[PDB]
């Protein structure tokens, strides 16, 4: 596996729920970057170098993802709920002396991110989410058209071991199908081939695949309920946040993203990017420029 | 293929139609009654209620087009041969080959979708209609919410463009077909099925060409079947044939809405009763299903 963060350090951060692997680089205000499915921290390898010019960039693998430890799940998928992942990452940042930091997330990491901002808003200076609406919003707009588009939200949430057994016949196919299908081009040309190998090797592990399904199971139940409580209470994110989405990504399909995020955040700024779902890889310059301008 | 004859005394017929052969087990005498199976099953799912029905009717237990031992017509981009409108036309053709232009019809799961679509497109072909543990395809997609998407996830999963579901089903087809059978029962396991019948479902599911047909069925159910259904809704077209709507107490139809009140918006003459069962009524509750079918059809 190639080193896609030249000049970055490598930290194994002990937490109560297991170690968090993270690439660390740059100097200045701390900036935590969180990846999503079916990816690892290396999806940031094209925009984290630019972020390292201005920030202490911490490129972390999600709990259970990449090289981070995999906490054993339970019937409620607790460790892979976004609320528990946020607590673990807060604990991880405390190990480095970061009790107040900027945070940008993509896909699952973005769901950890906005959940972090709702649960522990005092930990974030600024927040950025990439090509997501809140989990509640995806489920509340799960009509026929949307159910066909993000079928994997219902499929991967099926009880174990149904998705795990089906994924176990050809994991390379599914991980590359998911990467290709969500891009603007519809193939794998946007990604670095070395980055694809990072995602393919991580997806080759049956334990890692179970974790991702547990992530999606928590996304269909516990994550939805924690969100549902916040909507119906009217709890908004007070942290100033940036909402980035691809013009042909996932978030723009179900709704107009900025109007949705204005219901969830008292101070949200939104901008589209001509790209599919993988903004930091399909459009690295535009995403990096947007994150540098926001967090500065 | 060493399977089991679950229809003793029933003859076997390969009915030639324009789009390919329809396999059927034929038994009994009297008025013609066509029985249509669903997913992920074959005609043998009727093996516990077909004999009791054969006491009164010429029972025809047919594999759906592309299912079981019926031929698999070449599909197209629109999945035409596996839309319920084309399947009903092919079965109408098949029944004509036996001299049956007016017949009773009982369908379960996918076969029930062929059945009510048949009743909507050619009601003159049906004397009476029985649908088992389904609501119209349009109603499922209309009531699509978080709870339903997790419940009938395979409606979205199998409808994905090829070869995504085909390749995933190939990862463990034996587990999948058995998981579908077990998860939709009341018991939650395979104890409601005859093991010889499970062998029928597993062998058909072991063939990748058959699994591709099933995905074509579900692609049709997510697109053309929905569009065909939607037009009847917007035009207010109702099923005029006297129909019976049976559903399991723990089946798929009770999740979204109460099946009798839904089917009353699709049909002018409909009665219904819940059967203490999961989705597979004729195997989980054979005595209860056959009696209700016998009473309604006679």
Which SSEs are present, and which pair or pack?
Two copies of one chain form a homodimer.
Chain A: E1 9-13, E2 20-26, E3 30-34, H1 48-52, E4 56-60, H2 82-95, E5 101-106, H3 108-119, E6 124-130, H4 135-140, H5 144-149, H6 151-155, H7 162-167, H8 171-181, H9 193-204, H10 206-220, H11 222-233, E7 241-246, H12 251-254, H13 257-264, E8 268-273, H14 279-282, H15 284-295
Parallel strand pairs in A: 3-4, 3-5, 5-6, 6-7, 7-8
Antiparallel strand pairs in A: 1-2, 2-4
PDB class: hydrolase
Keywords: time-resolved, catalysis, intermediate, hydrolase
Assembly: dimeric
Describe this structure as you would to a colleague.
- Two copies of one chain form a homodimer.
- Chain A has 296 residues and is α/β, with parallel strands linked by helices.
- Chain A has a single domain, classed as Rossmann fold, CATH 3.40.50.1820.
- Chain A is built from 15 helices and eight strands.
- An eight-stranded mixed beta sheet of chain A has the order 1-2-4-3-5-6-7-8, with helices on both faces.
- In chain A, strand 3, helix 1 and strand 4 form a beta-alpha-beta unit.
- In chain A, helix 8 crosses helix 9.
- The longest helix of chain A is centred in the C-terminal third of the chain and has 15 residues, at 206-220.
- The two termini of chain A are 33 Å apart.
- The A-B interface holds A 139-140, 142-144, 147-148, 151, 153-155, 157-158, 162, 165-170, 173-174, 177, 220, 224 and B 141-142, 144-146, 149-150, 153, 155-157, 159-160, 164, 167-172, 175-176, 179, 222, 226.
- Chain A: Fluoroacetate binds at residues 108, 111, 152-153, 216.
- Chain A: Keywords: Hydrolase.
- Chain A: Belongs to the AB hydrolase superfamily. Epoxide hydrolase family.
- Chain A: This is Fluoroacetate dehalogenase.
- Chain A: The active site is at 107 (nucleophile), 277 (proton acceptor).
- The PDB classes it as hydrolase.
